[PDB]
Symmetry: C2
Subunit: 391 residues, 2 copies
């Protein structure tokens, strides 16, 4: 049948044009946590109310975090029910898994429903599913639970991405690009859902770097629809994927390790992550942009994973970016904190929306081409080159 | 403006022309070979369960029926002697198990990849992508980063790390590899599946017989492939082409295979009639894959099926009236290696091409042009890969 012209089959089977983002939805747990009052809340709920000096150390970390609030599934009531999670290093993985194996696909489905609504196509047109999370693992995975919760077709092609950490927001785009571009009609639902129940723990005045996560990490899920060859007048791209890369930074061994253990997930930073990123990022820009004749990085619209404010500040200084470049990035960090893989997609959403509100000519702040970066364990840097769409 | 002058031209230049092909297969096993015939004695001894005489006989029956003669295991007596909590049915042991597999999984995976790269014969700098798949352990950075560092691949390889999927994932890594290779001109994809049972190994319980099954069937192993489109003539040598893929969740199969990673390590919760579910539904999957190729006779396909156990194989064979030879390569790998989870169908691919060459067949798939690979695992998920052989 198709066996007598397999070149014809291969050509019919693949898409024509570039992968595009056709919709973005986001969701968070309902409970907003004010950063100004977090130190007091966190030392009370971890029964450390009376560790005065360490409390002020954490207050200082929070005040320099450039975060105003975060959303968290972990409420005071839940922590009351789960005292082992409020301790610094108690056996608590089972407890944490019992939470996140449910909440991760639940929050993800909430984001996906909003993306699907925007997209406006029936959910039976979804052909692929990429689920990304760093909180908990289970078999079948969160990709399976989402498929069930959403009532997608049994035959969706799923890619389940566990435990990759903060660069993975870039990774899901890199995977989605290939899936959508190589399969005609393919519509990829991408979900990044991050819940900090797996990392939350009490303070230790002999292990201060564990507090950094307690100041920075928030909860959130983002969902995208990705597909090539958008139907005219029906589907509405907001960005096109042009090119991707992934690399491990030199001399970055052990910069950010994460171990899933009986005490849950613990992170360790052994090197200067902002310094590593800012010293090397311009090489990634040249690698990505020379072929497109772009060398002035202020002519790009920017999305950078906001692992902490120091990364943003040092990247901006090293590249001499105009202070407006990272504005959308800084705004999501301020309103949501660091939601790991979900973050850059919240930033894409904020940018295309702020751009329509400001009367910009494109979804990329009036500019044609831009860049999205994810940063995480390796030290790994994900680069995605984006095209905006006219507004 | 460079490539901005014509991004349509760019998308055409950036993608490959032809189908993804398998250019090499390498495999590796831990050194310690475990004879099934003596395994009941050994297992009940090392888990300090010799007094459970009736439980042992149940286990001896499981082993006698397993259609497995040999497995390989990272876990040795000595290692188990150093880790008594791993030998218990249910003791806090995740940390000890992680400490093992976070190192052994990439280690064994590197061994398999080195063999595959050697067969391929091209510089390792030409590897552009890496897919690493395992159901044993998790860590940040992942086993994929470890493999990259161990092989000395380019810092810029594009990695897809696939943790905790289970036994269908041998099909999954092909499905992913197919899109990476076909959509990127020049791309050469290192695919590694590496599986170590130290994460699930535990002692017996007479109130959890179904949990004992996995102790009879699971073995360790790693497989590596090089996948790419547009093979370089007379320099690269394809053994299979990837034509078409699907993934599906079988009806009425909720909870049939659940695996939970807990403080006690990896534990499974099993329901349903899995061999019934697969054999009941598999022809639908065949018809979905092969009607477009005008193939309707399942005996005209060469076959690779994940050997979850011999009942799966027997009931698929009965259901479809396959000739008994159809699953020969599948059963041979099961006999020599046990069920090595995601790695298993890749050992069978290797066995398929090697037996075909040795028997003097006209193709890498037993003289047939087209074949099918199936992965089976949690979901219940079925992965389907349509394969082309290559002439010999």
């Amino acid at each position: 049948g198709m066996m007598k012209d397999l070149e014809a089959f291969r050509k019919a089977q693949r898409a024509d044009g570039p992968a595009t983002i056709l919709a973005i939805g986001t969701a968070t747990p309902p409970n907003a946590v004010d950063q100004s009052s977090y130190p007091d809340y966190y030392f009370k709920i971890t029964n450390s109310e009376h560790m005065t000096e360490l409390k002020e150390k954490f207050r200082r970390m929070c005040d320099k975090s450039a975060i105003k609030k975060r959303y968290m599934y972990l409420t005071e009531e839940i922590l009351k029910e789960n005292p082992k999670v409020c301790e610094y290093m108690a056996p608590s993985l089972d407890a944490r898994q019992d939470m996140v194996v449910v909440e991760v696909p639940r929050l993800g489905k909430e984001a996906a429903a909003k993306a699907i609504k925007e997209w406006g196509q029936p959910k039976s047109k979804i052909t692929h599913v990429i689920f990304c999370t760093t909180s908990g693992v289970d078999m079948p995975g969160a990709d399976y639970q989402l498929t069930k919760l959403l009532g997608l077709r049994p035959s969706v092609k799923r890619v389940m991405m566990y435990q990759q950490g903060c660069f993975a927001g870039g990774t899901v785009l890199r995977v989605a690009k290939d899936l959508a571009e190589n399969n005609r009609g393919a519509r990829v639902l991408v979900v990044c859902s991050e819940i900090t129940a797996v990392t939350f723990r009490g303070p230790s005045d002999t292990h201060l770097d564990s507090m950094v996560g307690q100041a920075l990490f928030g909860d959130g899920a983002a969902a995208l629809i990705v597909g090539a060859d958008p139907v005219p007048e029906v589907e509405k791209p907001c960005f096109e994927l042009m090119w991707t890369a992934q690399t491990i930074l030199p001399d970055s061994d052990g910069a950010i390790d994460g171990h899933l253990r009986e005490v849950g997930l613990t992170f360790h930073l052994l090197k200067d992550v902002p310094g590593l990123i800012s010293k090397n990022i311009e090489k990634s820009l040249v690698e990505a942009f020379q072929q497109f004749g772009i060398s002035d990085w202020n002519q790009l619209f920017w999305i950078a994973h906001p692992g902490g404010p120091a990364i943003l500040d040092q990247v901006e200084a090293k590249l001499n970016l105009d202070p407006k470049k990272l504005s959308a990035t800084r705004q999501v960090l301020s309103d949501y904190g660091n939601m790991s893989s979900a973050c850059v997609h919240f930033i894409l959403d904020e940018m295309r929306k702020s751009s329509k509100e400001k009367g910009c000519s494109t979804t990329g702040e009036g500019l044609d081409v831009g860049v999205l970066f994810g940063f995480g364990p390796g030290l790994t840097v994900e680069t995605v080159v984006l095209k905006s769409v006219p507004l």
